[PDB]
Each structure stands twice: as structure tokens, then as C-alpha cells.
Amino acid sequence: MSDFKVEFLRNELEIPGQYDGRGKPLPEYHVRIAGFDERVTVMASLRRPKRIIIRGHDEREHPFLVKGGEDLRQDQRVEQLFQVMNGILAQDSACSQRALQLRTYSVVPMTSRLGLIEWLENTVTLKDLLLNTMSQEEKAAYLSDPRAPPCEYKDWLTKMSGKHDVGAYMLMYKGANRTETVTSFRKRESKVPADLLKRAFVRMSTSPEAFLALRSHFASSHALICISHWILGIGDRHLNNFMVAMETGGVIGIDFGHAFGSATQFLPVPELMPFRLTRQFINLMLPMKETGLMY
Amino acid sequence: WDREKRLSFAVPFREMKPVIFLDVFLPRVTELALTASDRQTKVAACELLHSMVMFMLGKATQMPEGGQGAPPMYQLYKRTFPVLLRLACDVDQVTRQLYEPLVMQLIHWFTNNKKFESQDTVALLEAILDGIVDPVDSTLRDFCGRC
Amino acid sequence: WDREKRLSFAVPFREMKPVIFLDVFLPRVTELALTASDRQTKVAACELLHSMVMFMLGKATQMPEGGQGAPPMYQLYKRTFPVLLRLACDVDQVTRQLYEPLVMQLIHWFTNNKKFESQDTVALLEAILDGIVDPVDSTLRDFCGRC
Amino acid sequence: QGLIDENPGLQLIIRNFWSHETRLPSNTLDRLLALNSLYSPKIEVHFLSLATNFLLEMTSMSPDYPNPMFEHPLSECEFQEYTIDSDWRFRSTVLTPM
Ligand SMILES: Nc1ncnc2c1ncn2[C@@H]1O[C@H](COP(=O)(O)OP(=O)(O)OP(=O)(O)O)[C@@H](O)[C@H]1O
């Protein structure tokens, strides 16, 4: 990665996977590698993938995710799908009139154990965004200073008859009568701060007209993603697995190691929920339930 | 144009010191200064933007925060430098006599013992080296070359 | 103690803003803060010098001048740092609880990404490494070692 | 002469009497000019501290009196409250191993 430069006796490497079916290509206009750079960092999530940087002959950055050991064949195929969903969405009146499209993005399965997955620049994950709306005083409730889990959940497992951290859920579904689990879940759902995402968009927005619009596109793009993720049975909708496209303010559903029902098939902790409509989204729509614009 | 309010400006009253954040005025004042067809509006919108970019440089140079991320106002500089070029070689001669010297003045300041390494100058350089490219203006490119 | 007046301080009046140059008070206030035998004078002379060295750091950090010679207030720093040591480990416990933390606080600030190369820190280092030598005090040397 | 009086309570009432904006003017020039009338030699050892106590305390009401001198701190850092013993003590008065 230090040794690679533009030199003769080498086929100049066009930037990976930039070729697509959207019109005739103009191949020589596609970016090509000038070189790698003396910079790296590792992402927090369990396979510790890597924010590599490429400089192109355009004298421009392509920050990129290397992911690997996981086979990007599945991730490529779950995007072919999303490209054809943008296809029908652009091509029926009920969705062209609403300007409805997902964002897909480029996977490229560079080997059976790699891909250079494109980083969307000027974006942040929804958990990063959420904590970034908190003050140091509510952040104490995730530093886990008021109780050893952020909300009581891991310790409250003992009241729910579950002892250990992993798999103990396998017991609670036995005696989890509606009344005790709802009333205790409602006590936690009512602990964690009000109006966090309302605060996120008030911070983004210039003025009330710009807020009303930005709100609607987040909730619209979010809505379309969560049905289409359901349609292909994807799961593990963890709050790092969404990004706010921070310029346009829309949601992007980020990754798919558990596509095609395979999230809920895998035994040790079953996923009952088909997709995500949680509290800070209901709180984003507050004066009307999810039965409004989302529905 | 920014994630959090820069330009916090205390209005000189006698009883009190209420605060205006001037970075709400730029998105409209920049459009007036270029595109106002009424000439008297245009020049007054320029001298507001001039005094407001003087305010900008000063407030940044008090070091409201010293790096450790996006330098304060880099996100403004990235958005106001291309406006400053398009508006030096504006037609209106009263505008040109005000901003040709100001861009060269900025261009001097943005080479300096500390600041030559700053992303303030990266934003500046890539603004001007997008300036020379412009697909719809012949006089912008000449100016950006001389810049 | 200096060739030209640093510390130009505009008194907060309602009609007007007259200017005091505070660097005339130091030569007497430093002597009071150490050597005043009346205890009530002593502590009040300390909290003036504390607030006046807070003023000092701030006024220098606005960059009244950025080098190109003796840094502004280096000549004050060279004269006030040895006073600050002698006056942390003063006997009087009300004085000690005010200046032991302040010298460690200064000593943190005077290591930093820009300022670690500054003669502000050379003056500081050579003040403390004259502190450990003192031929007539046993407790100053211990403190300057811990510094 | 009541302006040097031995009891700090009466010393304060006569100070507060002259400080009033009808006894002794509020604009800084006429205050500075008027203070020359607040003298007779029996006060002289105290006078300079009184004249300055009448000028700076005109700032006790000024719009800048509660403003910060510099807007923000030296860099990213965080601050706390504190307390000082200030009661009965000079350091050199209690034995080591106790
Ligand atoms: N397009 C993207 N733009 C920016 N960040 C991304 C993007 N795609 C993935 N990430 C980052 O990569 C990290 C993990 O890799 P990725 O999401 O692709 O695979 P994953 O199987 O879901 O990994 P993991 O389960 O560990 O989160 C994410 O947590 C996120 O920080």
C-alpha cells in the first residue's frame, strides 16, 4: 500500500465497481487510483472493519470501508434488489408523485473475503447522532453511572427471572405475562430522555419551514426503508445499522449480514420484531401516532 | 450552513447586551450581493457582507475553539470563499473596487507562519481551483488565475 | 519591569472607558502578598495578584503581539513566576490553598501543542530550576522538585 | 469626619450617605471634581482610599460589571467550585504524626 503509484507496465486501476447500467459509460471519465495514504482507523462494531482512504487521479479522497472475512456476495445481492426497488418506485404514480426512492450504495466483493464498500461522506450513524444530542448529564445514563446498565435492563433481568447477560432472554418469554412486562417496559421507556430527535432536527434546521420539511423527509425515507427491509426479511436493526445522510437528512439502512429472514432463523436470541418503529420515532411525530405520515 | 452557531454578536445597547447570531443572514445576503438587479440594494448588501467577513476573521482569530476537529467557521469559509470570487469580478464597478483588493488581502493573510498549514487555506485553495474551471464564465477564470 | 505598557485595562464606567495600565501595580502588590505582616492585607493582596495573573494569561492569549522579538509579557513572566513559587508554599494556609493549585494549573498550560516551544516555558523552566537551588529556604526546594 | 468613624457599622452608613446620587454626582467627571470637596485634614491619612472607593463603586451598577473579561476559556476544558479553610489557622501550628 506504500509501494503502489501510477507507473507504466501497469494497467491503471479504475476506482472499484464504478461501472453500472445507467447509460453508456464514458469509461475514461471514471476515477482511477493515484495511491493509498499514510492514514487508517478501525470501526467499533464486532468485525472491526477499516476506514481506508484512496486518492484518485482526480486529486480527491475516496474514504472507503474495507470489510472482509464476511463474504460480500450476500451484500451485493441484497443491493441488486434495492436497485430494482428504486426501479419500480420511480415507475408507478403512487411513488413518483411522492418522490420515493431508497439510497442504495456500491458494494464490490473484491475477493470471497473482501469488499471496498463506499463510505457516504457528510453522514453519521443514528446512535452517534442520538448521543450527540445528549448533554453530559443525560450521557451519564449511558456512561452507566446512575445504574450499571444504561437503562436498568441487564440487572432488571433478575426481576424478569433471567440471570446472565446472553441468552437469559430464553427464559423470560415463559412467564412474561402482558401486565408485568408492559408495566416494567413502560417504566424504562419513560426513563430515557424526551424530545432527542426533535432536538436533532431543530439543531439542523434554519427555521420552522425548513424544520417541517426536514422532519418529513427523515420520516418518509425511514418509512420506505423499514418496509423494504421487512420485504426481504432483514434484521439486527441495531442503531449503528442506520445513518442520517446529514446534508439531505434522510435515513440509509447500512448493512445486511443477516438478510432474507436469516436474522430470525438464528436460534440463540430470536428476533420477534419484524422491523423498527421505536420511541424516539413516535416522539418525533409526537402530536400524531405512527398512523400518520409513516403509516 | 453550520452545525452550531458561530458569529455570536452582542448588539451595543445602553441598558443591555442582547445577542444576534449573524450566520443566519449570510444565505440571503450573499444572494442579494450577487443577484440583486436594483443597484442600490446590491451595493448596500455588499458592504454588509464586507463588514460581516471582517467580523468573521476577527472572531475566528480570538480562537473561539482551536481545532481538534473542523476548525471553527471552516464550514462558513468553504461556503463564502466561492461567493467572494464571483463577486470581485462582478460587473458593477463599485462592487469590483471593494472586493478585488479584499480577495488579494485575504490571500496574503492565508499564507503565514501558523496559518499556511491550516484547512482554512485548503478550503481557500480548492475554492480558487474550482474558480478557474467555471463552465459558464470567461472573466471569473482570468481572475482566479491571477489569484 | 517592562519597556512599554502591557495590561491596558478599560475600567467599566457607564459614561466612558478610561484606561489603567495594571503593570504599575505589580512591583508593590507582589511585595505585599509575600511580606505583609498584617494578615488581612496579605490575603487581599493575593487575590488581587491572582485575578491580575488571570488577566495576564488572557491578554497574552488574544495575541497583542505574536512574537517577532521578546514575546509580549515575557518580561513580566520572568519577574512574576519566581514570586508565584515563593508564594504557593508560603506559611499562611489561606494563601497556600490558592496558589499550589494555580502553579500546577499554569504548569499544565505551559505544556501544549504550540506553547511547549515558547520562551514563556523557558522563563517558567528556569524560574523553577532556580527555585530548587534556594540557599535560604527548605520548603521552596521541595515544592520546586514536585513542580 | 464621620467617614473615618471607629465602628464599621457607622463607617458604612456615612459612606452610603455620600455615595447617593443626589449628595455626590453620578457622571464620572463631576464625581471626580466633587470629591475634592470631601476633604478636611483630619481625614488625610484615609483620603486616597475613600476617593477611590467612591469612584470604583460607581462601577458597582455598570453594564459590564457582571460580564466576563474574555468570552470563553483557553481551550476545551471543564471547571468546578471550591472552598478555602479561612477560619482559625496558619500552617505551622499542629504536630506531624497525629
Ligand atoms: N456506507 C457506509 N458509510 C459509512 N459507514 C459505514 C458504511 N457501511 C458501513 N459502515 C460502518 O461499518 C461498520 C461495520 O461494518 P458493516 O456495517 O458494513 O458490516 P456489519 O456486518 O454490519 O458489521 P457489524 O456487525 O460489526 O456492525 C458499521 O458499524 C459502520 O460504522
Side-chain angles (χ1 to χ4, degrees):
Chain A
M1 267 57 61
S2 84
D3 207 18
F4 196 90
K5 278 93 176 177
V6 73
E7 291 177 318
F8 295 107
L9 288 78
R10 163 149 67 255
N11 310 320
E12 298 183 64
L13 301 183
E14 291 189 37
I15 280 284
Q18 188 154 26
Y19 287 83
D20 62 5
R22 185 171 280 206
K24 197 164 69 85
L26 293 307
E28 188 168 306
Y29 296 23
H30 293 183
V31 188
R32 69 188 198 253
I33 298 176
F36 311 89
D37 196 4
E38 315 311 338
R39 174 167 278 155
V40 63
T41 191
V42 289
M43 306 291 89
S45 63
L46 292 303
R47 194 144 270 108
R48 299 171 63 213
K50 177 183 288 158
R51 194 174 191 264
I52 194 166
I53 166 65
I54 315 301
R55 57 165 72 135
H57 85 305
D58 196 25
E59 181 48 323
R60 167 176 280 151
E61 307 298 72
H62 289 75
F64 255 130
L65 189 76
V66 173
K67 183 158 77 153
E70 173 168 43
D71 60 316
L72 288 300
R73 305 181 301 162
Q74 190 85 330
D75 290 14
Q76 175 66 303
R77 293 182 190 230
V78 73
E79 293 309 324
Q80 279 192 357
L81 280 159
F82 279 37
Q83 189 183 22
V84 60
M85 290 184 76
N86 286 357
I88 205 170
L89 276 174
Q91 205 173 102
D92 198 4
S93 178
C95 288
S96 62
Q97 203 70 20
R98 298 296 208 305
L100 285 175
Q101 296 286 275
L102 293 70
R103 245 194 193 282
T104 180
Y105 60 85
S106 67
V107 176
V108 61
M110 281 308 314
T111 194
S112 185
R113 312 183 85 188
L114 286 182
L116 274 286
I117 321 304
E118 70 178 335
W119 193 276
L120 282 316
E121 291 180 289
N122 304 91
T123 75
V124 298
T125 71
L126 181 59
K127 175 165 284 203
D128 196 26
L129 189 100
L130 258 299
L131 287 158
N132 180 280
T133 98
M134 295 195 184
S135 80
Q136 60 86 355
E137 191 171 333
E138 302 86 36
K139 181 63 182 289
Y142 277 79
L143 181 59
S144 305
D145 223 35
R147 297 296 183 278
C151 184
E152 192 181 21
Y153 213 108
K154 298 207 310 176
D155 296 0
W156 166 83
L157 301 186
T158 60
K159 188 78 70 172
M160 199 64 260
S161 201
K163 296 86 184 177
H164 36 87
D165 301 0
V166 190
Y169 319 127
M170 187 66 204
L171 311 179
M172 64 183 73
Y173 282 76
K174 302 186 72 181
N177 57 83
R178 267 58 166 159
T179 46
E180 94 175 62
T181 39
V182 173
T183 54
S184 59
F185 176 54
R186 292 299 200 180
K187 186 57 174 182
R188 48 190 73 94
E189 182 176 54
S190 60
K191 182 56 61 178
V192 185
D195 312 352
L196 291 164
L197 282 178
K198 183 178 168 67
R199 277 181 281 175
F201 305 117
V202 173
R203 188 182 288 172
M204 292 191 209
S205 301
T206 55
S207 279
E209 71 279 28
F211 171 93
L212 186 287
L214 191 77
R215 183 178 85 176
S216 75
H217 178 45
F218 180 105
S220 303
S221 56
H222 169 264
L224 183 60
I225 273 162
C226 82
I227 180 66
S228 52
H229 280 222
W230 174 76
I231 292 283
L232 299 162
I234 294 133
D236 191 22
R237 306 299 78 215
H238 185 289
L239 289 296
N240 294 133
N241 306 5
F242 295 105
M243 283 179 99
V244 188
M246 206 72 162
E247 178 177 39
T248 194
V251 172
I252 304 164
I254 286 293
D255 203 81
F256 308 95
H258 268 123
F260 317 113
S262 70
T264 301
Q265 184 269 3
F266 184 47
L267 170 69
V269 177
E271 295 193 2
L272 276 285
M273 41 72 182
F275 67 101
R276 193 170 182 76
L277 291 184
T278 56
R279 172 185 160 86
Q280 310 303 143
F281 309 140
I282 277 63
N283 193 169
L284 178 61
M285 311 312 291
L286 189 57
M288 53 268 293
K289 298 179 66 71
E290 77 296 335
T291 57
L293 176 143
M294 302 176 84
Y295 167 62
Chain B
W1 293 14
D2 204 347
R3 208 81 66 80
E4 294 193 53
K5 305 183 191 77
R6 277 57 181 243
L7 319 186
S8 51
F9 170 70
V11 189
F13 281 105
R14 173 159 35 250
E15 173 169 357
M16 57 160 59
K17 292 275 200 165
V19 69
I20 293 178
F21 303 99
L22 294 175
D23 64 12
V24 305
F25 298 157
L26 282 165
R28 180 59 181 210
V29 181
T30 56
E31 291 192 70
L32 287 180
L34 283 75
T35 303
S37 47
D38 166 32
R39 197 187 183 207
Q40 178 55 9
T41 296
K42 180 152 175 166
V43 62
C46 296
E47 93 196 289
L48 176 61
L49 174 63
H50 180 291
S51 55
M52 185 182 285
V53 73
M54 293 315 168
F55 186 99
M56 277 189 64
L57 271 172
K59 187 67 178 174
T61 309
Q62 288 191 341
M63 191 253 291
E65 299 191 351
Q68 292 176 349
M73 310 166 57
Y74 161 80
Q75 214 75 347
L76 274 58
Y77 281 121
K78 173 165 277 283
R79 220 78 74 92
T80 194
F81 293 144
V83 160
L84 283 152
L85 314 184
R86 276 170 173 171
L87 200 58
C89 58
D90 216 51
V91 171
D92 173 49
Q93 185 168 12
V94 171
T95 300
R96 184 179 299 196
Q97 286 190 341
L98 186 57
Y99 279 112
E100 171 152 65
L102 189 145
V103 172
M104 304 316 167
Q105 275 170 17
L106 290 179
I107 289 282
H108 288 58
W109 175 249
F110 290 126
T111 63
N112 255 300
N113 301 346
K114 165 59 177 186
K115 297 195 70 75
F116 195 66
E117 304 298 346
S118 178
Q119 299 204 356
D120 308 323
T121 75
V122 176
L124 185 59
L125 175 66
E126 292 190 339
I128 315 150
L129 293 180
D130 195 15
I132 67 176
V133 162
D134 195 300
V136 300
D137 186 328
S138 65
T139 178
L140 177 60
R141 309 181 197 121
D142 170 82
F143 178 87
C144 295
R146 185 168 63 262
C147 181
Chain C
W1 293 14
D2 204 347
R3 208 81 66 80
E4 294 193 53
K5 305 183 191 76
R6 277 57 181 243
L7 319 186
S8 51
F9 170 70
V11 189
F13 281 105
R14 173 159 35 250
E15 173 169 357
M16 57 160 59
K17 292 275 200 165
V19 69
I20 293 178
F21 303 99
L22 294 175
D23 64 12
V24 305
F25 298 157
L26 282 165
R28 180 59 181 210
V29 181
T30 56
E31 291 192 70
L32 287 180
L34 283 75
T35 303
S37 47
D38 166 32
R39 197 187 183 206
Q40 178 55 9
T41 296
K42 180 152 175 166
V43 62
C46 296
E47 93 196 289
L48 176 61
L49 174 63
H50 180 291
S51 55
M52 185 182 285
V53 73
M54 293 315 168
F55 186 98
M56 276 189 64
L57 271 172
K59 187 66 178 174
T61 309
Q62 288 191 341
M63 186 174 279
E65 299 97 70
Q68 292 176 349
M73 310 166 57
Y74 161 81
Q75 214 75 346
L76 274 58
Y77 281 121
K78 173 165 277 283
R79 220 78 74 92
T80 194
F81 293 144
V83 160
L84 283 152
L85 314 184
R86 276 170 173 171
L87 200 58
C89 58
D90 216 51
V91 172
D92 173 49
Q93 185 168 12
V94 172
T95 300
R96 184 179 299 196
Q97 286 190 341
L98 187 57
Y99 279 112
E100 171 152 65
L102 189 145
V103 172
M104 304 316 167
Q105 276 170 17
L106 290 179
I107 289 282
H108 288 58
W109 175 250
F110 290 126
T111 63
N112 255 300
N113 301 346
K114 165 59 177 186
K115 297 195 70 75
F116 195 66
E117 304 298 346
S118 178
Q119 299 204 356
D120 308 323
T121 75
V122 176
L124 184 59
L125 175 66
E126 292 190 339
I128 315 150
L129 293 180
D130 195 15
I132 67 176
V133 162
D134 195 301
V136 300
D137 186 328
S138 65
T139 178
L140 177 60
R141 309 181 197 121
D142 170 82
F143 178 87
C144 295
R146 185 168 63 261
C147 181
Chain D
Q1 297 158 68
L3 203 64
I4 52 162
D5 206 5
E6 184 180 296
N7 173 2
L10 299 182
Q11 171 67 93
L12 182 60
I13 293 299
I14 308 300
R15 184 210 302 183
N16 206 51
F17 166 103
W18 285 111
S19 190
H20 187 298
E21 300 181 64
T22 197
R23 278 56 165 262
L24 210 173
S26 195
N27 84 65
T28 56
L29 257 295
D30 296 333
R31 175 160 282 251
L32 189 289
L33 268 283
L35 282 161
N36 283 52
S37 190
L38 298 205
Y39 165 88
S40 56
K42 284 179 287 201
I43 216 183
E44 177 150 308
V45 49
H46 291 90
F47 175 68
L48 305 169
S49 77
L50 289 164
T52 49
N53 190 83
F54 286 129
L55 284 143
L56 291 179
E57 295 298 286
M58 189 48 59
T59 80
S60 64
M61 194 194 299
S62 180
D64 271 309
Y65 183 97
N67 284 331
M69 292 182 172
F70 308 100
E71 187 175 294
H72 273 280
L74 289 166
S75 193
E76 289 196 52
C77 59
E78 299 186 326
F79 296 91
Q80 266 293 133
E81 289 175 310
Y82 198 44
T83 190
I84 297 196
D85 293 17
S86 66
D87 52 8
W88 281 104
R89 280 156 263 265
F90 300 104
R91 176 69 273 190
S92 195
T93 206
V94 293
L95 304 316
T96 291
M98 297 171 69

